[PDB]
Amino acid sequence: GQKVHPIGMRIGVIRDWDSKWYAEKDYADFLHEDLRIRDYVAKRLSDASVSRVEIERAANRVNITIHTAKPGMVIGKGGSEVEALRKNLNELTQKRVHINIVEIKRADLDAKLVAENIARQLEGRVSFRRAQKQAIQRTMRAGAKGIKTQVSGRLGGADIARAEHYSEGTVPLHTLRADIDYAWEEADTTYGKLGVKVWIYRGE
Amino acid sequence: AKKSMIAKQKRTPKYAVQAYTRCERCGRPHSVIRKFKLCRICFRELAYKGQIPGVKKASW
Amino acid sequence: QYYGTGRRKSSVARVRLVPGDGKIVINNRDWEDYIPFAALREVIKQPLVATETLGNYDVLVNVHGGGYTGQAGAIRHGVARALLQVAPEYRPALKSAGLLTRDSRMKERKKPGLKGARRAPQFSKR
Amino acid sequence: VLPDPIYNSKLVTRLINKMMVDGKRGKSQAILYSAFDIIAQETGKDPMEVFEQAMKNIMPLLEVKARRVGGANYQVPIEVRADRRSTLGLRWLVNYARLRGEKTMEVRVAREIMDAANNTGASVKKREDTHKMADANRAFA
Amino acid sequence: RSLKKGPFVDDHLMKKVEAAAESEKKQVIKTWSRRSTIFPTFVGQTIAVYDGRKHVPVYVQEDMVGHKLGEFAPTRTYRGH
Amino acid sequence: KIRIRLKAYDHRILDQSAEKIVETAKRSGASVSGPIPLPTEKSIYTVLRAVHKYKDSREQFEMRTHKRLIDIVNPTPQTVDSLMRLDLPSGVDIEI
RNA sequence: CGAAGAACCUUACCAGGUCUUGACAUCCUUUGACCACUCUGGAGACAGAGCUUUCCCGGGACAAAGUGACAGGUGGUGCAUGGUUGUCGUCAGCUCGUGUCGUGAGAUGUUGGGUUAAGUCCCGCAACGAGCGCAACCCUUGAUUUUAGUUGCCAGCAUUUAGUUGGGCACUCUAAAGUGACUGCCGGUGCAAGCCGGAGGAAGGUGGGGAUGACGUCAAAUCAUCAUGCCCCUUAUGACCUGGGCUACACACGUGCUACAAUGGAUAGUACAAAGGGUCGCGAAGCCGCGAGGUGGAGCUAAUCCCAUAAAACUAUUCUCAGUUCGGAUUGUAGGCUGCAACUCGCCUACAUGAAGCCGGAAUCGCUAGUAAUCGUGGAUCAGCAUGCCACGGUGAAUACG
Ligand SMILES: [Mg+2]
Ligand SMILES: [Mg+2]
Ligand SMILES: [Mg+2]
Ligand SMILES: [Mg+2]
Ligand SMILES: [Mg+2]
Ligand SMILES: [Mg+2]
Ligand SMILES: [Mg+2]
Ligand SMILES: [Zn+2]
């Protein structure tokens, strides 16, 4: 069959939407502003392990919280990275900006991060067995009560495609008391695109 | 086509009746909701992702 | 002034009872000018005849929501409630008559791909 | 179901529900009331008694069922359920009362209940014909 | 226009037709206008109306005033299968 | 004789923000009403689940609003200042 | 069905008229406001002129011309792909670790006896256990407590054309946190799981309805939402403009709306809804107009005000069973809106015309309850354009032997 996006199934249930504001007459403007913002962030901070972005609006200021595993790149030895960010984001938004940077602990408990790991591996021509399995073991060591992954594409350069999925632990997608994380990431290959999907069942 | 069409959307037409809506993400004209300004399919994506405020999945 | 609320479909009757001869007002109108049908008027009576209290009290009603039959059902419901209120020993009679059963039959959803709640299109293989 | 508000019969309410068209219970119920008023006019007696006699006349006992037997399909007779008994009576009543062709519906229905209490009418011809075919095919019981 | 606030006619056609009072009707006027009404002032001067692929001539009359130009220049050529 | 209208998408945030306002408003002036709930005006956007075909299979998205209303009954400049300083958990809208 | 809106635009197609670093981006070099508005030749794109371009503090942001790198392709392949989707099927099934049997493939488990909506649950068994699914956690509806009472309510009260004004949250209504329904209790039977009945209660047996769609099947559909490998065009398979076509018409199918009438139609009066939308948007009252509408501008960023007479129902009068006062097509004339523009090719109104049709061959479809049927309403898309789509309430059945 076809599965529902297990995040979308849980918005307004146990997860809060990431784009947080109220608006009227300003809604589309703020939305597409913040989509441009996420494009900027993903474009210039894919390397930095950026994995979640929550937006906030009040008093015209563009408040942001970037949850990342390595802060030391978003900030760090210079102190000028976040200032560059708010400068260019001022140029876009035509507003004020402020940017908190949160440290994620257990970076292998975020499906987005894990999917980027696997995707960079598969672009570097690593085996799609070892990739999935090592990501799984890293999660279950990092503290996941459940893990699941799959890859679909021209696996290994085939003509015909298929899917390879592997799971440890309890991963119930029909339960909603589940705190599940999910992600989909894309890898490029000289043969074509590979779709990596991940989802994690977490502690409490 | 679609890049030239997305351009021609944004510049002002000869007459104002010639306006028409397009999703800024993917400029498809059909099923674009002027309240969100998104097309239906991009809307479904982002609404799953929780990148749209206040919208969730309608049970009832 | 005894009191009860009564609900049927989307109809809501705030109803009250006083001791009287049998006169009845509904929305500042005659029961006959509001419910002209003998069937629905008898439906209103049903508690007052299940327990012989018709020739004793006046039924004073206000109503919103729904249609005429739904409002009637609400009214009899709130009436039976207020009869309980004035006398819990009417509980057995009115329960066994089924007037305390708040009619939970609400009007069902429409659904996608269906031309109603349950109706689907005309199927054709070819 | 439930008995009629006025008369102490569920048959009236069922007949109302079986004449009803698109929820028009008010129209159906009123015309049946006026039709009993008509038969009381032209007879002067118990509408319940005359309607009961008409029932008892239109009321079948035996009816065919279509059953595969011996490489074909046959009509085997069978004693009808007591509920389907009344159901078929009221059904037939309403359908002949529609296809009759007088002026007004209450009139059609009232004349049919009269004829039925008198052992006349299409509705009784129907019972007789059902008995006739079932009895023709009583070899298969 | 359907309304008393009208009529309508393209300025780029009205101007040429007004200049065509000294035409003497030896010449002919091409227009890509099919939406413009016919005034009586158009009478006599043949107009070559653009149907989609060609300019088709029409001779105006008193009888074809009040109508448009496209009614006399069909779009879809059809021959009874 | 002044009024606050709070409207948002999240009733827990909104209720708690209103309780915050009400406690601070009672501290800065004692006579104030409680918060009163209004109806939840909402919008159900109905979308094709598929891309190309399948008009018959869909997905529905409800954007609700929850909103509360407050009435101040004896203002002071202390109250006005406590509301002029205070910034709320965003995702909401305050109206005075 | 994509299409939750084909007049132009959309629009990708066609004819014509045109451009080639381009309609759209980066990198270089020169320059800096670029442009805007008027005139002329134009179908317009576009050419000629004018008036007039204020860049801001070497930097920043956007801009004209050169200049090649590049661009662009709704050009292809869904038999290379991702992602998204139907489908068997919300069917109850699909598997796995360890163990054991089998040379082995495979089996076992997962069969059996019962039971359940359900590989649900019990007893038994060379299997013991687990995962995905089922169920349940979620939303909504069904009764009720506390909190808060305005933009909602009006009982006890006065008074107004108006719940109006005062006053009060009684009651509704609203919406947060709670309660409750769990075979929890009783009787029968079962060994047991469970099954049947009974009580209380609003609700009794996963209460009702939703969302929620397992491994995988149809190389199912999608390169036209998007991205995307390969190939192809790259002074044209690219780009602009006007006009046309997507609305053709001998004919076939599907899906629906309207009817074929007296449980009805014309005319008048007239009661009771829910769910929704509104800022340059809803648009009141009053007035003009047969009417569609025009005028007007109140109130409203909305439980305040508007869209908004709800219609079926009911009551009266008439038509008297007729191709009819049925039906309402088609056509002619004249109007109104929208929009630069209503011929191709919008909708609506008035008058007239009055078509086919007097209940549908062989066949075939939905539905088990507030359902089917039936009546209106709203929303999206949208300037305008719906019998379509999604939600809303009103009325409200028949039947289930098996
Ligand atoms: Mg348009
Ligand atoms: Mg395929
Ligand atoms: Mg295909
Ligand atoms: Mg479930
Ligand atoms: Mg295929
Ligand atoms: Mg078409
Ligand atoms: Mg059955
Ligand atoms: Zn889009």
Short mmCIF file of C-alpha atoms in Angstrom, two decimals, chain A residues 31-148:
data_model
loop_
_atom_site.label_atom_id
_atom_site.label_comp_id
_atom_site.label_asym_id
_atom_site.label_seq_id
_atom_site.Cartn_x
_atom_site.Cartn_y
_atom_site.Cartn_z
CA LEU A 31 5.21 31.59 4.49
CA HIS A 32 7.18 32.12 1.30
CA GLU A 33 9.63 34.33 3.19
CA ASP A 34 10.30 31.46 5.54
CA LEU A 35 10.53 28.97 2.69
CA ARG A 36 13.18 31.17 1.12
CA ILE A 37 14.84 31.19 4.54
CA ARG A 38 14.86 27.41 4.74
CA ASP A 39 16.28 27.29 1.22
CA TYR A 40 19.11 29.61 2.33
CA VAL A 41 19.78 27.57 5.48
CA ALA A 42 19.75 24.21 3.70
CA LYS A 43 21.91 25.67 0.93
CA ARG A 44 24.67 27.11 3.10
CA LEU A 45 24.45 24.78 6.11
CA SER A 46 23.91 21.29 4.71
CA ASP A 47 27.50 20.50 5.65
CA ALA A 48 26.91 21.69 9.21
CA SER A 49 24.48 18.88 10.11
CA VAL A 50 21.50 21.24 10.39
CA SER A 51 18.50 19.11 11.30
CA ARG A 52 15.68 21.29 12.58
CA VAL A 53 14.54 24.89 12.18
CA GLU A 54 11.76 26.52 14.19
CA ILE A 55 10.55 30.00 13.22
CA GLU A 56 8.94 32.65 15.42
CA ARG A 57 7.31 36.00 14.69
CA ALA A 58 6.67 39.02 16.87
CA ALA A 59 7.54 42.73 16.84
CA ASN A 60 8.60 42.33 13.18
CA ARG A 61 11.66 40.32 14.23
CA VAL A 62 12.48 37.06 12.44
CA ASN A 63 13.25 34.77 15.35
CA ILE A 64 14.82 31.42 14.56
CA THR A 65 16.09 28.38 16.45
CA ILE A 66 18.41 26.06 14.53
CA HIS A 67 18.80 22.69 16.20
CA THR A 68 22.15 21.27 15.03
CA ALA A 69 24.49 18.55 16.27
CA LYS A 70 27.71 20.51 15.65
CA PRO A 71 27.17 24.12 16.74
CA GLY A 72 30.92 24.68 16.27
CA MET A 73 30.30 25.33 12.55
CA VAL A 74 27.15 27.48 12.77
CA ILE A 75 29.07 29.49 15.37
CA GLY A 76 32.58 28.91 16.61
CA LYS A 77 36.15 30.02 16.13
CA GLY A 78 35.10 33.21 14.33
CA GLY A 79 31.87 34.36 15.94
CA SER A 80 30.92 35.86 12.56
CA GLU A 81 28.92 33.01 11.03
CA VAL A 82 25.63 33.84 12.77
CA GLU A 83 26.23 37.51 12.06
CA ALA A 84 26.66 36.73 8.36
CA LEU A 85 23.42 34.74 8.61
CA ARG A 86 21.35 37.51 10.15
CA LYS A 87 22.85 40.02 7.71
CA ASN A 88 21.82 38.09 4.61
CA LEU A 89 18.51 37.14 6.22
CA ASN A 90 17.91 40.83 6.87
CA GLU A 91 18.58 41.45 3.18
CA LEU A 92 15.94 38.84 2.32
CA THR A 93 13.29 39.37 5.01
CA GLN A 94 13.50 43.18 4.97
CA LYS A 95 13.15 42.84 8.76
CA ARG A 96 15.18 42.17 11.87
CA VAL A 97 16.52 38.67 12.54
CA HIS A 98 17.70 36.71 15.55
CA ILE A 99 19.06 33.16 15.55
CA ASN A 100 19.38 30.78 18.46
CA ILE A 101 21.53 27.69 17.91
CA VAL A 102 20.68 24.57 19.92
CA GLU A 103 22.96 21.60 20.39
CA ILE A 104 21.42 18.22 19.67
CA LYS A 105 22.79 15.44 21.81
CA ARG A 106 22.64 11.94 20.35
CA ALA A 107 22.79 13.18 16.77
CA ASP A 108 21.97 9.65 15.63
CA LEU A 109 18.46 10.06 17.03
CA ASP A 110 17.34 12.37 14.20
CA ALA A 111 16.12 10.74 11.01
CA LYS A 112 17.19 13.75 8.94
CA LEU A 113 20.79 13.53 10.15
CA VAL A 114 20.90 9.78 9.70
CA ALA A 115 19.47 10.08 6.21
CA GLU A 116 22.09 12.64 5.24
CA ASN A 117 24.77 10.29 6.56
CA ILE A 118 23.46 7.39 4.50
CA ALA A 119 22.97 9.61 1.47
CA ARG A 120 26.51 10.99 1.51
CA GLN A 121 27.75 7.41 1.86
CA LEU A 122 25.71 6.19 -1.10
CA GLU A 123 27.04 9.08 -3.18
CA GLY A 124 30.53 8.04 -2.16
CA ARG A 125 29.64 4.59 -3.51
CA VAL A 126 29.37 2.74 -0.20
CA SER A 127 27.40 -0.48 0.04
CA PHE A 128 23.73 0.11 0.78
CA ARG A 129 23.80 -2.83 3.19
CA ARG A 130 26.62 -1.47 5.33
CA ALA A 131 25.17 2.03 5.27
CA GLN A 132 21.73 1.02 6.56
CA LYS A 133 23.16 -1.42 9.08
CA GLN A 134 25.75 0.95 10.54
CA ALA A 135 23.18 3.72 10.85
CA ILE A 136 20.86 1.25 12.59
CA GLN A 137 23.50 0.18 15.06
CA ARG A 138 24.52 3.76 15.77
CA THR A 139 20.89 4.59 16.55
CA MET A 140 20.25 1.62 18.81
CA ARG A 141 23.48 2.44 20.64
CA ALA A 142 22.57 6.14 20.84
CA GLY A 143 19.32 5.15 22.54
CA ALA A 144 16.61 4.37 19.98
CA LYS A 145 13.91 1.96 21.07
CA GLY A 146 13.34 1.32 17.37
CA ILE A 147 14.79 2.03 13.97
CA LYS A 148 13.88 1.46 10.35
#
